[model samples]
Target: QNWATFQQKHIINTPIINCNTIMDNNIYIVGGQCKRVNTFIISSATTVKAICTGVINMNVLSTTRFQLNTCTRTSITPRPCPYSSRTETNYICVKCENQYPVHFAGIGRCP
Candidate 1:
């Protein structure tokens, strides 16, 4: 349905028997607790495993962040790489503005 409008809305306190409802261009869930649960429960088991894996990854990332010369912005110096093994390439990196040498600005590659 396109451009459907309701001046006064009806609120059904009881659970809606259908699987979907649309209001204000947004689709919402109104039912299907049992039907959708079959897939959702299965996928959630995988999601649980991924959440644990993500926790492990975050631990490693945090540990490695402190293992470097320095992880902060001021610790990096954008310097030219060895001229024999490199070519200049211009690129746009969103993080470069904030992260400096990790993503250099108006500077060349590092040694």
Candidate 2:
């Protein structure tokens, strides 16, 4: 068992939702946004059992999970949210082929 902080940020006046899913006994974190910089940091435990392949970029998610019988991305959008206080129309989806992990602070907007 282990614990750590998961942080998320979003711009003001936008729709947001956090989605969690599990595939092959592994838990996945997927979220969708930012300008005003809404912040959330919560303690979470990583206990899902599965193989760790490595961290992957969004561009190769589909290709990497191609062989997984039950993996796919839903609730997708054309792009990430902008700094404007408008509704967010895009979200992120992640698929792994038994991946690896990395730690970073202060990530940026999608595009």
Candidate 3:
């Protein structure tokens, strides 16, 4: 699996999982660690990674307040992992590996 998929699971975002208990149950935990928070970008991986190339110019973050969602884990116990979400907007930075997004580096625009 692409680490993007394995780690970030960025291929798509689902409404049921975005703020629902299902996301808390399945999406956040990978391997064993629980992800405290995650971002969902509406755009494709290629456009997000293009910022790292010359397309948007390297070392910069997106200027657009991209419409996105953020889900955050709310439960304190492992057995009852729970989450809530907000459909939010923000500029973003992405880390690229071989022209693909590997990390969602920052929430705000690059400095």
Q: What would the per-residue lDDT of candidate 2 be over residues 1-111, giving only the tens digit for each residue?
A: 111221122111222333221211112323321112322212121311111235443212212111111123333333332221222222222222234212221222222
Clashing pairs in 2: 11-34, 11-35, 52-98, 52-99, 53-98, 53-99, 53-100, 54-99, 54-100
Better of 2 and 3 by lDDT: 3
Candidate with the greatest TM-score versus the true structure: 3
How does each model score on TM-score?
Answer: 0.12, 0.19, 0.67
The runs of at least 3 residues in candidate 3 whose Cα sits more than 4 Å from the true structure, single-residue gaps closed, are 1-8, 11-17, 21-27, 54-60
Q: How does residue 89 of candidate 1 score in lDDT?
A: 23
**2-88, model 1: which lDDT tens digit per residue?**
111111111122222222211211222124111111000111122222222423111111111110010111222222111111122
Supply every candidate's count of residue pairs whose N, Cα or C atoms clash at under 3 angstroms: 0, 9, 0
- The candidates, ranked best first by TM-score, are 3, 2, 1
The TM-score, computed over Cα atoms with residue i paired to residue i, of candidate 2 is 0.19
Q: Which RMSD values do the candidates have, in order? A: 24.8, 14.2, 3.9
Q: Which candidate is the best by lDDT?
A: 3
